[PDB]
């Protein structure tokens, strides 16, 4: 170990970069999309449109 | 087979080269996120203080 | 087969290095969660006391 404190790193002996990486990639993206969509489905916290919320105005 | 690279173990060193980068970039990403999150807050403070009725 | 890694195993030491970290991070996660719950409480106190009628 190049000046390490933990064994942490041994995880990659057990687990495989390729799979972890490909997985995170999907995961993060889906969640990303989800939130964006969700937000822009609302009234408050939609950027992209005229303030639909009619917040008090009418 | 008496090792981790036990008699031609098929190409994965004790590489914590990967660990290093993995963990850095995982932090960077979360850190960026924090900063970004803050900025958005200033544009749209999203939680909102508790209203006149509620409880 | 008369050992722990008995006659050329596919390999797991007595690694409880894993056990160490696993427990740490499990507690950290739960700790963080506690603090976070406390913070939110102050934003939106979620249970409520028992109302005028109830029972």
């Amino acid at each position: 170990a190049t000046e390490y404190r933990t064994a942490s790193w041994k995880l990659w002996l057990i687990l495989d970069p390729r799979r972890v990486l490909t997985a995170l990639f999907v995961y993060l993206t889906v969640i990303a999309l989800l939130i964006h969509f969700g937000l822009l489905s609302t009234d408050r916290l939609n950027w992209w449109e005229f303030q639909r919320g009619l917040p008090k105005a009418a | 087979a008496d090792l981790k690279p036990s008699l031609t173990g098929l190409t994965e060193e004790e590489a914590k080269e990967f660990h290093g980068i993995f963990v850095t970039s995982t932090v960077l990403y979360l850190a960026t996120a924090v900063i970004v999150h803050y900025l958005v807050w200033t544009a749209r403070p999203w939680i909102a203080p508790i209203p006149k009725g509620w409880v | 087969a008369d050992l722990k890694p008995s006659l050329t195993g596919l390999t797991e030491e007595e690694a409880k290095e894993f056990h160490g970290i696993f427990v740490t991070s499990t507690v950290l996660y739960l700790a963080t969660a506690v603090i976070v719950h406390y913070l939110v409480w102050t934003a939106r106190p979620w249970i409520a006391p028992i109302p005028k009628g109830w029972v």
Binding site: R5 | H37, Y38, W41, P45, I47 | L28, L39, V40, A43
Partner: peptide, 24 residues
Amino acid sequence: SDWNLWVPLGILGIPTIWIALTYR
């Protein structure tokens, strides 16, 4: 504006640190 609304900061931030520190 973020006034005692540190809530998202707490959630996002805290892990960020111990993620940094536990796996050094």
